[PDB]
Design a protein around this ligand. Structure first.
Ligand code: HEC
Ligand code: HEC
Ligand code: HEC
Ligand code: HEC
Ligand SMILES: [Ca+2]
Ligand SMILES: [Ca+2]
Ligand code: NA
Ligand code: NA
Ligand code: NA
Ligand code: NA
Lengths: 376, 354, 125, 376, 125, 355
């Protein structure tokens, strides 16, 4: 029941009473672990933004990272580093644009690489986790470009240099599967495999169309690079699962997150990060609520949990708050993270019981994106 | 009377007696079977039309007469932008002032003067009847009055529902009578969200009562010379088409190289394209706009030639603000635009789509 | 106020998030920062790009195409924030997508989001 | 009673019905007038900030201006221009610092000058209006430097160039009185008159000491340049008035904003911009409330109005809100401006009756500074 | 909670604005963004400059000199904002003045405000 | 025992019989009338001290012995920072290891060896009684035991209240017996808010029971060579005082040029200043720090000479992080700091404050 602030007050009183000296210094964040959670605040399109580095178990902010206009955060699964692609201007929001990649040490938070992206090539959009992506080996960062056309930038983090833009078809999002390979979702309804050697035009293969034109796949699918699992829900909560572990796309049996009776009762997924995927447990988590069909970006008060293999519901939680985004830790007995944009608060739940354990408030102006490293 | 005036213009429109050697009428270059354009293959293909002498070619593509009646008289609006008038360069104030000009154009119908026109009208008993009933006795004996009256009949004729029926698929879909296909709806959506609607819509905002897919403004979109058409024109390789700057009274150097925004109605059936008919295909006309947006090497290449588009005839006054939109049209979006523009075809021209 | 409830358009106040023309607006209403319904505030730059929605007008029972254009080159206004998604589709259908910063074509290559205007550019269908 | 938002809905509806066309474009702000009011938002020390340009008569936002870290706003009294001195960094709040002055057209709000200030010379402080100041002719901007020592930067707005730093004594604030002359308040309890040139040590002359070391003169005195009147409250609401209209300092009789009984009962001034001065009316406005002596930065809910000549109280307004800053328009029948940092709302009052007339909300994160032009 | 009421120090929670050492703090408590009571959060830079206040400790009845130090180079944390002014004097007595961004001496010439630490440097007198 | 050991040290401290020519005691260079410093004029003024031979000059200024007993024994803390010891370079671990060295130093007391020292102690009947009562019979017969015992005695004497009275105005003010003047209080506030507190306060944070205004650390503040002192010492134009690197066992080149932070107690009366006594005036020592912060031309000029401070003797490992504060001390704050430092004078030396 003793809060972190109270324990700190007693320790400081004990130090003063015992005459214990200590040097004012710059703290190091604790070593990255399974329970570390990052919360990004795109700040409702503000020119500058903030990332919050949080200890999930303590419910404590252990560090922060400044960003520019709608940055894309990435977190290496092995915990070795974090990074973002960011955007600044020479006069706040006006003048010369500089797009750039920064890599940070994950305990000092110090920038270890600052890589300028030529010709201001970043896609400026409400933050989608998979618009910027690390390759599994972590030596390459891939970012999406919309203007003048869909394109994918190759950033070498090892050599700390921009390499080139890749011409792609009318496709969206970046799901890396190998050092030289990533998948995209295309307007025509297919996925595009993009294989890029160190030189030339990439080899682009399409799969067969896997969803009809009238079936809308959300902007925030879950992707486990280590499982090669792409979990893509539709506006109705229908869930597409694609296995990419063999290096090619294999379409798993489609599953419904809601029942037909619930769908008729107006139950629909809604929010920002509406889906989480736990790799070890092979488990899908979805933000749902009762809502009109075009209120798809509003907060949801419920989470449903289903077996990815069979699509049986394992649980349904009443979250107790207006939740926009969810994610989970990738350790055993995982935490369920429930982020409220409206409350600016990360709510930390036990993923098994759905019970609220603790919370971290005051997370910016409009926090939206939760990132966890898969370290196991 | 307004019916009779049009009826008179209907006669004059198909009358070769208004050409010097009586070989051509308005209908010769504005063929009612080809949306009032010219089907005849000349020294430069369909880019430019042959006059009454059988040899002379123009330097400009013959435009449709469909919906020309909806264009306001030439004027300068409060923003300083010139709007309206007739001809690719707006040198005519309106349909009336324009009508007599092809008649006296030596590279076109080639009548020596108004007197010669009057003499030809006077030779026709039905014209003496038709003109005098509308304009008074002895009208045809006065070359000035006869010429002006003929101009008014043709203008009146051009203003009938027949030239502007508004019965295209677009028009029917906008009356809730049918739906666009998936591809057509995409095309329309692209058209109104991309830079197209900045010049090819009547109004900046609101809904037009009679849309003709032109704001009537003048723009230099940086087109190259049409080599063979310029050759056929006989105006010389030294010649520069200065567009709107050619209108008498227009002195402003910022208007050099600017041309009237054409109406896109019947665009699918009125190729070749642009003021000099340089592009034979509709898809090419669309793809041209990618040269200002796309960074792909293929955007610099005219697909009809496999060579670079070519330098602008007039390198200044380009509408860069509008043209450099930051977004490239992919092949899917080009397909969609073609599909949408095809819906701007009048009912009677729908069989021409194949 | 029930955020999940079907959106109810009104035609009495342009500064409120339930004004009929804002049916797929994302960001801020420019009228709250020195613009107007269909004009940008001073100092900002008007994009030529747009996202589109068919917004039902309760006054005349007609559905209009609103082509939302951004005013750019300023930090977000922070006044009259609104997010509606009537007929809004995912990013792979960008013409209907509203998370995108549609600042393209703006003067001085302005790409920062300040606010959005709501002009009618046609009747639906 | 019809709101601006309703009136606009009405007009837009009539335009649509009438088939009236208009071109979407960049508006001009209405011409600078007496009832224009500027609200700056230092945003509780955020790296980037906003200024709100407001029509006080309509209670409408007519424009905004972006700024960097704790910029100093100035407004030309004749309405010809506005300017600020501002600070940006190459990576949001880290990296290379650039200090610079911008001058803006008051109707387009476009920058007409961007003048770099060499060696990052700006004083970074919670915003005090008189730490950066225009000369009466509006040709020169003067800014305070604290580090490494008290100094004053001279910026030539006409030539659009930085000129020089001036070494000054241990003094604070800048109150210009002439093209080449300003006054400062010194630690020793005096004022310093600084008469400067393009080069050469400036002629620095101390007035007599005018207050004891245990009277505390607030960071936000009111200064009317056109009257040459410096109105300087102490923590207790005692007001020092200095007449600089002769070009030399003349010390006026001190006045008490609060009565003895009020002072005995805990009445003290408090807030940010605690004092305003109306020139034509020769009136002093002071933010006061019942408070502890060391709560001098908290909001006040009352404004006292007093005759500057006699010290006679003309009114005590109950503001009805938590007010941190006041200021007045400088025309006849002036408006009393009452800004709430907590509410982020500018409350607009009739300065004669004290009655709230209208309000402008959503003014950033922590708006603190009100500026008006004296145009009469 | 009555803002104009005399400040009441406690010694049982360092994240609260009434914590005794915060008697003349201006900004944010570093403990709330990854620092601690007397240490800066990672990635920020410890200023060497300081402002002082005599703060009464309700635990031991002693008044201690707190020389506040800013952690700089980051945008303001936005967490545990507090402003107290016990003994706080105007800018012309800068050693007691708390509006000044006391970031001088910070590594890499960092001068942006992030948060403030509250270390004891002596006893009052 | 505690009293007696110290009392024995008291005798040795004033005894010139511990110098070769018997002209010189500890008290000669560490004069109780001058806060245990050397008032004698040499070839380099009061910068360096003249030894027993009457000709040899040292290369370092003679520091106060007052409060030296508060300094911890030499060690390296977990921070990698060396702390404590005795001598400007901390080459002696503590007071006991230090005490015997001036006795054997040929530039100082100049006794040939421990046997010669034992011999002198043996000659005094009072020492035979005093030493044997404390260390056993025949102590003075064993050169090693006798030298070590003498060291022990001298160390014990320097640990008495005589050397660290804590009766300065500052101490009285901290007890609440009196108050600072406005100038002193300003100076105190400046001292604890500016970079001084980073090196001249015992602790990083909290309150010290027995403050002596030093963290006992080693810092290179970038001082020039004292030219006349270096000439007088005869060590050569090419000689470099490496400070802490000179201590045997220290091999780390980053310790070159670093010296022990002196206690600021009695500083007003123990001029001249710094390890080589380069500065005559207290104000000048203070102004030196402005060279790292001020941009004014005057800031790089030594006001005592009218010439630049000078190139650092060791132009590496300077404490730039602490020195480059970004804030210059104006004359008012210098006046204030002078006034504060003067309150650090032990009561018996208050009459010395006028000169
Ligand atoms: C020799 C072929 C030819 C004949 C015969 C001809 N035209 Fe044309 N028409 C053209 C060409 C070429 C232009 C464009 C010339 C230019 O823009 O300078 C044109 C332009 C026009 C325009 C302007 C349309 C627009 O969008 O700007 C109208 C109206 C017109 N003609 C009507 C007539 C009438 C009436 C007649 C019969 C008197 C006629 N034409 C005879 C070829 C011809
Ligand atoms: C800057 C204004 C402007 C913009 C933007 C613009 N156009 Fe045009 N368009 C013109 C003008 C002017 C011409 C005539 C050019 C000439 O011949 O000199 C033209 C010609 C055409 C033609 C040939 C029609 C004919 O009768 O010859 C087609 C087809 C066309 N445009 C389609 C488009 C499409 C599709 C887009 C959007 C991708 C577009 N335009 C963008 C102004 C514009
Ligand atoms: C010739 C003058 C002279 C005499 C005689 C002398 N000293 Fe010193 N003392 C010095 C000098 C010079 C230093 C500093 C030298 C150095 O750092 O290498 C010093 C340093 C010291 C220190 C270290 C102080 C500190 O703060 O680091 C102590 C303790 C000391 N002396 C005590 C003694 C004792 C005990 C005796 C008698 C055995 C004595 N001194 C005799 C000149 C003298
Ligand atoms: C970087 C740590 C550091 C800082 C910061 C510092 N000092 Fe020092 N001080 C020293 C060291 C080390 C010496 C001895 C230098 C030497 O002789 O090599 C010293 C010597 C002195 C002396 C001479 C004392 C004597 O016995 O010779 C005075 C006086 C002094 N400092 C005052 C100050 C004042 C006042 C400030 C604040 C402006 C200050 N110092 C800042 C470490 C520091
Ligand atoms: Ca054509
Ligand atoms: Ca000395
Ligand atoms: Na050709
Ligand atoms: Na002309
Ligand atoms: Na000397
Ligand atoms: Na050594």
């Amino acid at each position: 029941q003793e809060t972190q602030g109270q324990a700190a007050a007693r320790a400081a009183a004990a130090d003063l009473a015992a005459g214990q000296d200590d040097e004012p210094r710059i703290l190091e964040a604790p070593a990255p672990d399974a329970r570390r959670v990052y919360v990004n605040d795109p700040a409702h399109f503000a020119a500058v933004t903030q990332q919050f580095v949080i200890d999930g178990e303590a419910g404590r902010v252990i560090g922060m990272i400044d960003g520019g206009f709608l940055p894309n955060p990435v977190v290496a699964d092995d915990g070795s580093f974090i990074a973002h692609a960011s955007t600044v201007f020479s006069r706040i929001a006006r003048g010369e644009r500089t797009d750039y990649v920064e890599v940070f040490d994950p305990v000092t938070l110090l920038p270890t690489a600052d890589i300028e992206l030529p010709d201001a090539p970043r896609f400026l959009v409400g933050t989608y986790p998979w618009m910027t992506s690390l390759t599994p080996d972590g030596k390459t960062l891939l970012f999406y470009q919309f203007s003048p056309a869909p394109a994918v930038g190759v950033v070498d983090l090892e050599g700390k240099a921009f390499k080139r833009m890749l011409d792609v078809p009318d496709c969206y999002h970046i799901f890396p599967t190998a050092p030289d390979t990533f998948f995209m979702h295309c307007r025509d309804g297919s996925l595009a495999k993009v294989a890029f050697g160190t030189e030339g035009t990439p080899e682009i293969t399409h799969t067969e169309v896997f969803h009809p034109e009238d079936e809308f796949l959300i902007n925030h699918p879950a992707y486990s690079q280590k499982a090669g699992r792409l979990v893509w829900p539709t506006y109705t909560g229908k869930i597409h699962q694609i296995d990419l572990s063999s290096g090619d796309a294999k379409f798993l049996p489609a599953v419904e997150a809601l029942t037909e009776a619930e769908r008729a009762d107006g139950w629909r997924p809604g929010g920002w990060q509406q889906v989480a995927y736990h790799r070890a447990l092979d488990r899908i988590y979805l933000l749902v609520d009762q809502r009109d069909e075009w209120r798809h970006k509003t907060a949801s008060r419920f989470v449903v949990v289903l077996d990815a293999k069979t699509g049986e519901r394992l649980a349904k939680f009443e979250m107790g708050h207006e939740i926009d985004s969810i994610n989970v830790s990738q350790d055993e007995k995982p935490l369920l993270y429930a982020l409220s944009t409206g409350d600016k608060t990360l709510y930390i739940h036990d993923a098994e019981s759905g019970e609220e354990l603790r919370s971290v408030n005051q997370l910016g102006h409009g926090p939206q994106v939760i990132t966890t490293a898969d370290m196991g | 009377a307004d019916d009779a005036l049009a009826a008179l213009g209907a006669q004059l429109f198909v009358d070769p007696a208004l050409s010097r050697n009586a070989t051509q009428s308005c209908a010769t270059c504005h063929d009612p079977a080809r949306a009032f354009t010219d089907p005849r293959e000349g020294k430069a293909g369909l880019a430019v039309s042959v006059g009454d002498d059988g040899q002379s070619h123009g330097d400009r593509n013959t435009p449709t007469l469909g919906y020309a009646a909806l264009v306001p008289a030439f004027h300068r609006d409060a923003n300083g932008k010139y709007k309206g008038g007739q001809f690719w360069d707006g040198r005519a104030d309106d349909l009336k002032q324009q009508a007599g000009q092809p008649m006296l154009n030596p590279v076109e119908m080639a009548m020596p003067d108004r007197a010669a026109v009057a003499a030809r009208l006077r030779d026709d008993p039905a014209y003496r009847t038709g003109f005098e009933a509308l304009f008074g006795k002895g009208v045809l004996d006065d070359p000035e009055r006869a010429f002006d009256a003929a101009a008014e009949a043709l203008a009146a004729y051009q203003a009938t529902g027949e030239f502007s029926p508004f019965d295209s698929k677009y028009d029917r879909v906008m009356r809730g009578e049918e739906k666009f296909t998936p591809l057509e709806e995409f095309g329309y959506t692209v058209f109104i969200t991309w830079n197209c609607r900045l010049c090819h819509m009547q109004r900046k905002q609101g809904v037009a009562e009679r849309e003709t897919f032109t704001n009537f403004e003048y723009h230099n979109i940086g087109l190259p010379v049409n080599e063979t058409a310029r050759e056929a024109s006989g105006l010389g390789a030294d010649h520069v088409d200065h567009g709107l700057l050619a209108r008498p009274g227009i002195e402003d150097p910022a208007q050099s190289g600017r041309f009237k925004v054409p109406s896109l109605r019947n665009v699918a059936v009125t190729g070749p394209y642009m003021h000099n008919g340089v592009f034979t295909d509709l898809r090419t006309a669309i793809l041209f706009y990618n040269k200002y947006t796309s960074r792909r090497p293929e955007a610099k290449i005219n697909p009809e030639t496999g060579a670079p588009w070519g330098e602008p005839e007039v390198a200044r006054n380009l509408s860069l603000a509008e043209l450099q939109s930051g977004l490239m049209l992919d092949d899917g979006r080009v397909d969609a635009l073609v599909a949408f523009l095809e819906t701007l075809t009048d009912r009677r021209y729908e069989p021409l789509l194949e | 106020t029930d955020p999940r409830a079907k959106w109810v358009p009104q035609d009495n106040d342009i500064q409120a998030c339930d004004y009929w023309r804002h049916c797929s607006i994302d960001g801020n209403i420019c009228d709250c920062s020195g613009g107007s319904l269909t004009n940008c505030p001073p100092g900002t730059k008007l994009a030529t790009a747009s996202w589109v929605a068919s917004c039902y007008n309760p006054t005349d029972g007609q559905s209009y195409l609103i082509a939302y254009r951004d005013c750019c080159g300023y930090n977000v206004s922070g006044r009259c924030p609104c997010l509606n998604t009537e007929g809004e589709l995912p990013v792979y259908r960008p013409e209907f997508a509203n998370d995108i910063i549609w600042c393209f074509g703006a003067e001085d290559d302005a790409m920062t989001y300040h606010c959005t205007i709501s002009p009618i550019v046609g009747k639906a269908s």
